Amino acid sequence: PEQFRIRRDKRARLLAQGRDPYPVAVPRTHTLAEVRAAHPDLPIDTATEDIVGVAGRVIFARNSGKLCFATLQDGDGTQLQVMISLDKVGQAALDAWKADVDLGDIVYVHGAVISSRELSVLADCWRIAAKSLRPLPVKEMSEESRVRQRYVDLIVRPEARAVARLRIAVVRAIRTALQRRGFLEVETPVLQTLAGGAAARPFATHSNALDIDLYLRIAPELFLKRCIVGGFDKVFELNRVFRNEGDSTHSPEFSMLETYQTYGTYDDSAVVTRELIQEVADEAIGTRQLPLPDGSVYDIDGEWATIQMYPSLSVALGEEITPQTTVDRLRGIADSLGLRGFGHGKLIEELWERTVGKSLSAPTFVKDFPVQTTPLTRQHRSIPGVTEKWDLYLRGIELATGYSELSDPVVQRERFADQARAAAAMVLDEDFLAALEYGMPPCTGTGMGIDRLLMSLTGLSIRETVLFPIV
Amino acid sequence: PEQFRIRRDKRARLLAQGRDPYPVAVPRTHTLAEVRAAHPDLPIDTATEDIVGVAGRVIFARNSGKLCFATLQDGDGTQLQVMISLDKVGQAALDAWKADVDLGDIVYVHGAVISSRELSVLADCWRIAAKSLRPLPVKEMSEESRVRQRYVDLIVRPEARAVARLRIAVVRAIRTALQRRGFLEVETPVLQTLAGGAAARPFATHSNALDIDLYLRIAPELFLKRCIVGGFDKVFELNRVFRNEGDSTHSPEFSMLETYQTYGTYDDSAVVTRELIQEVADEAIGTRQLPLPDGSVYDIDGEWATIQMYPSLSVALGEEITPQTTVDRLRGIADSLGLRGFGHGKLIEELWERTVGKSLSAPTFVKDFPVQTTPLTRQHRSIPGVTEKWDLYLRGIELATGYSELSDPVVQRERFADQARAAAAMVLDEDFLAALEYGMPPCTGTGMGIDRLLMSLTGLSIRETVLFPIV
Ligand SMILES: N[C@@H](CCCC[NH3+])C(=O)O
Ligand SMILES: N[C@@H](CCCC[NH3+])C(=O)O
């Protein structure tokens, strides 16, 4: 905080001297990566006649009488050395360098590209591009200091830079994979008169303009389905959803992909989802043999096994479990395993996750879900009491879901009435039901969180994968 | 509502007969546009041996004894005729067609591609893909009925389909224009502990997980600037912002582009913005001679004039107006023109919009703004009392803004303290100021609303350009 005071004094002194420590422009000719790419093998201790204008954050300084060295680091982490020499710039210029420049300062330098006894610019000219009032921390940054000051994390930790660029490359890879298949990206409302399309409690805000509460969307699904009714063949939306969470490690704001494809079933969207994930790994990561932080390697290449929920649970419990199995039977199994109340569907999913889910290692689709827990998904084409839903588990993590969508408006109203009754202490989404009543062609939806994808591919947590986590 | 009851009866009858009016799948081989593209000139009244599976919404029907014709319309508005003939399908099939199929119903038909005495499929086979419980309206759709039921608007009005696809093509064109220049797209928070980076009242919501109010972002600007400090060279974010409006025709939710570029000034971002807009028109519209709904044509090709606010206002008022001109002088001019209170900057902008702004027709940049109204923009490099801001007016509409960004953390704190004092009845964004104190390289930001862009290019209002406007 004394170092704060001295940097603040240098700013005021620089101003007073008619020097400008926040100039509007410096004439930067090249990024440092550009200069590096244009001199891959310069014979050591040799000079060239490529004059450049570079700019960079001084991350290392090493002074003497007649010659000061610094490492400039460009924003991407590329480095170039500058040398401030009595012979080439003023004695005044050299003294100003020594008096004026601190670690963290952004500096412009103009000069000739050379190699040292290390690629360097021997300066004719330099100025401050931006005076840092706070010194950089060093081996001096806690996990939650990183998240409270991502801007400092990105300056000092190369891994923060690579994670930031990987998320961007992953999101781009997804847009590329879907646009190549003819998906159009749509923008549906964030503020809704009622938030539907998932199981979660909404955030409420007061509209001045309508003197009512509006709800931040929990999911785009009901609006994307209106797009299907409207004649979109292939649609997706990649954007924030909001779940007002209470005792939770799941973030209240997170980026979600949803896709809808007409004249396909959950079987089709299962294939597309595998291909999309494999294409994202190829584009953004460069391999399907994923390196993890424990030094392990997770293979997502080839075909992925599919299992059914009721059969795989039957095999794990050693008895036949079906959509007919009573709640009292299932409650007794749950008790025997040491586990708003008891529902057939909720018990099937809980016992499945507890017995089969925890065991899964290779990438696996589980399909054919209980009707009670899948209000928006079509009843199975041949199997009584299940719906056409899959969940994809990749490296143990619940990653993605796909459905053969319910288009029958009368079944859909019944399912919403069941839900409305069950949480009564009861208005339905009548506009959504109205859209289904105009006719929705058969279609398949998917959902996949971007942070879950990055975690499944890399082992990084939500606190590493989102630029600016809540705090 | 009787037509509702009859459609509902046909659904129940179809179910009872073991027929499925919402089948999970039909085997569609081709889109209708595909079939059209594969038979551009079939000699009229001739048969081919291309069997197809098509599916489409029956938008026109014309029945007889032995032969029923229908127009299927694919989601994109492409049409193909089907012919249901006693000779090729059952007598039973023909009667079921007549009894079972209504306008708005989605129907699959399998058969041979032929031309009529008009491109058609002569059916071997048909089924319902989705039974419509509500008939389509016709010349029967009010402007706010269109917006309350966009899904019906997209079915019946080709222009709704073309506007929906144009917005998507414009947003894609922008991503393409910025990615081609090396801009990375980032995701910054929507929910903030305090909403900054623009002049507007925020929406508030209660966090359960933190028992505090959070604020929906009014702008990404302060987080994008943290990205610049963090070493991003070129960043953009294309996403919703939220302004809690009261007496307003400006929407509470709207999609905004912001871009930031290091080592450029407002002069650089002015060029990029023109090029970006011209590239968007080229990609999404196909011309720079923009057709408007009044039949007029607006030319956005070539170079755009730039004017300065103080000089252009001086010429319009017939006296020299400068950053020194007093509020009392300006108040008197405002009165003479028949116009939380009186500020020098607010009066300059109001008199400029009233005298020069209203006159502009050709695309025009106005630059060099009053310091009081531009708290985040750098003081001008040579002109005392103005900031490096431009506003672009295109076809009379205020479209876009660009700034030479303020990086001086001490000037920035002063400007925030001025604002905080002026609305006191006073906490600053200390984390944002902290980021500037680590050092932000010189950079230029822009802002441009997607609905304003579409309006400036097309003459369409916000109620036409957003898929699902609030209602
Ligand atoms: N709305 C779902 C994703 C789409 C699944 C298919 N309709 C969710 O929040 O998980
Ligand atoms: N935050 C500005 C846009 C960016 C202008 C350059 N910093 C706005 O809401 O208009």
How would you characterize the overall build of this protein?
It is classed as ligase. Keywords: ligase, Mycobacterium tuberculosis, ATP binding. It forms a dimeric assembly. Two copies of one chain form a homodimer. Chain A is of the alpha+beta class. The first copy, chain A, has a domain at 156-465: 2-Layer Sandwich (BirA Bifunctional Protein, domain 2), CATH 3.30.930. The first copy, chain A, has helices spanning 2-16, 32-37, 91-100, 143-148, 150-156, 158-180, 221-229, 266-285, 309-317, 327-336, 344-355, 409-422, 430-437, 450-458, 462-465, and strands at 47-62, 67-73, 79-85, 106-115, 119-130, 184-185, 191-192, 204-207, 212-216, 234-242, 253-262, 289-291, 297-299, 305-308, 364-370, 386-394, 397-404, 443-449. Chain A has an eight-stranded mixed β-sheet, with helices on both faces. The first copy, chain A, has a five-stranded mixed beta barrel with strand order 1-2-3-5-4. A three-stranded antiparallel β-sheet of chain A has the order 7-9-8, with no helix packed on it. In chain A, helix 5 packs across helix 6 (158-180), helix 6 (158-180) packs across helix 8 (266-285) and helix 10 runs parallel beside helix 11 (344-355). Chain A is elongated and about 90 Å long. Chains A and B meet through helix 1, helix 5, helix 6, strand 6 and strand 8 of A and helix 1, helix 5, helix 6, strand 6 and strand 8 of B.
CATH topology of the domain at 156-465 in chain A: BirA Bifunctional Protein, domain 2
Q: What's the count of strands of chain A?
A: 18
Task: Assess the beta-strand content of chain A as a share of residues.
Answer: 25-35%
What summary fits the major beta sheet of chain A?
8 strands, mixed
What's the tally of helices of chain A? 15
CATH superfamily assignment of the domain at 156-465 in chain A? Bira Bifunctional Protein, Domain 2
- Distinct ligand kinds: lysine
Kindly report the oligomeric state of this protein.
Answer: homodimer
Q: Classify the secondary structure makeup of chain A into a structural class.
A: alpha+beta
Global shape of chain A: elongated
Strand order in space, largest sheet of chain A? 6-10-11-18-17-16-15-14
Q: Helix proportion of residues of chain A, in percent?
A: 25-40%
**What is the largest interface, and how many residues per chain?**
A-B, 108 and 108 residues
